[PDB]
Design a protein around this ligand. Structure first.
Ligand SMILES: CCCCCCCCO[C@@H]1O[C@H](CO)[C@H](O)[C@H](O)[C@H]1O[C@@H]1O[C@@H](C)[C@@H](O)[C@@H](O)[C@@H]1O
Ligand SMILES: O=c1ccn([C@@H]2O[C@H](COP(=O)(O)OP(=O)(O)O)[C@@H](O)[C@H]2O)c(=O)[nH]1
Ligand SMILES: [Mn+2]
Length: 291
């Protein structure tokens, strides 16, 4: 049950004036695409606080990637769901390497020890299994948000994202035609998507939803990866390939714009982005992924 909103004073929405004319703000299945200017955060904050919403954030920090945790968590404290209840779940092979980060009130962090796979591809892919293995979520949080650790928050990431199921537009492909998307194209793979199918190319580094929907997604992707492995095939973009297949066949209820997953070093700061919210931390891929 949801109580009434209180009286609020804010600018009247104008029916004959779009919030944004330069971008698509709703998908063909009527899911909002979240861009700056499309939401009044005061209204959304009210709605979600009135439900005493708790948000879980999963992040994996395996082997050398523990180095990314300090900046990740400190900037999350500044920008992620501030004012709401937050539970971080840090999955790592090195619990003693997790930095002691000071948390705001109503925010907690749990360290979950997991095994380290040798191949970075396996470390990345096994996140689906490890997220799905975990039964605490249903009792502890309302929503789960699942992100990469090699990142920092630079601006607001809040309850505007919350919805039963969301994916995020990959920053390299939001302007691309579907034939150019790097979906898995081999029919032998469970992740296969033909050249005439696809809505968007979603980023493996940021998806989420209700606990129920996230556990469905991660279970489905894990089982699809198991089938591929039995068939001696590994999808071209690993977990991201399976995520893309899942979100093609199970449409997300919101889609996040590339504000929510950007790489400024690689892609700069185009006119279409009013904010860069959650951004890549420069990596030496080969060095950091291997002993
Ligand atoms: C120079 C490297 C060239 C990367 C261009 C395209 O991007 C990659 O797209 C792939 C799918 O086609 C995967 O999503 C991959 O994770 C991503 O690279 C990641 O995300 C990117 C946004 C960058 O942060 C990159 O450094 C990451 O490895
Ligand atoms: O040795 C590794 C390799 C990967 N990861 C995790 O898997 C995610 C995805 O890998 P990565 O960020 O290297 O992929 P990219 O964004 O470069 O495609 C990372 O953010 C980490 O959360 C990790 O913890 N240790
Ligand atoms: Mn990453």
């Amino acid at each position: 049950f949801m109580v009434s909103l209180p009286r609020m004073v804010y600018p009247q929405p104008k029916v004959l004036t779009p919030c944004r004319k330069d971008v698509l703000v709703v998908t063909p299945w009527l899911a909002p695409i979240v861009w700056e200017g499309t939401f009044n955060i005061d209204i959304l904050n009210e709605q979600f606080r009135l439900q005493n919403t708790t948000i879980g954030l999963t992040v994996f920090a395996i082997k050398k990637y523990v180095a990314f945790l300090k900046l990740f968590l400190e900037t999350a404290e500044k920008h992620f769901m501030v004012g709401h209840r937050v539970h971080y779940y840090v999955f790592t092979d090195q619990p003693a390497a997790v930095p002691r980060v000071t948390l705001g009130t109503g925010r907690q962090l749990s360290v979950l020890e997991v095994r380290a796979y040798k191949r970075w591809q396996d470390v990345s892919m096994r996140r689906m299994e490890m997220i799905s293995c975990e039964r605490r979520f249903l009792s502890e949080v309302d929503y789960l948000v699942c992100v990469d650790v090699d990142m920092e928050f630079r601006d607001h990431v809040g309850v505007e994202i919350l919805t039963p199921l969301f994916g995020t537009l990959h920053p390299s492909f939001y302007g691309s035609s579907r034939e150019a998307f790097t979906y898995e194209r081999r029919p032998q793979s469970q992740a296969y998507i033909p050249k005439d199918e696809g809505d968007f190319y979603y980023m493996g580094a940021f998806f989420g939803g209700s606990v129920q929907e996230v556990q469905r997604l991660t279970r489905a992707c894990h089982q699809a990866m198991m089938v591929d492995q039995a068939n001696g095939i590994e999808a071209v973009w690993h977990d991201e390939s399976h995520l893309n297949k899942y979100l093609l066949r199970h449409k997300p209820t919101k889609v996040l714009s590339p504000e929510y997953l950007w790489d400024q070093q690689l892609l700069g700061w185009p006119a279409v982005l009013r904010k860069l919210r959650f951004t890549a931390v420069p990596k030496n891929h080969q060095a950091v992924r291997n002993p």
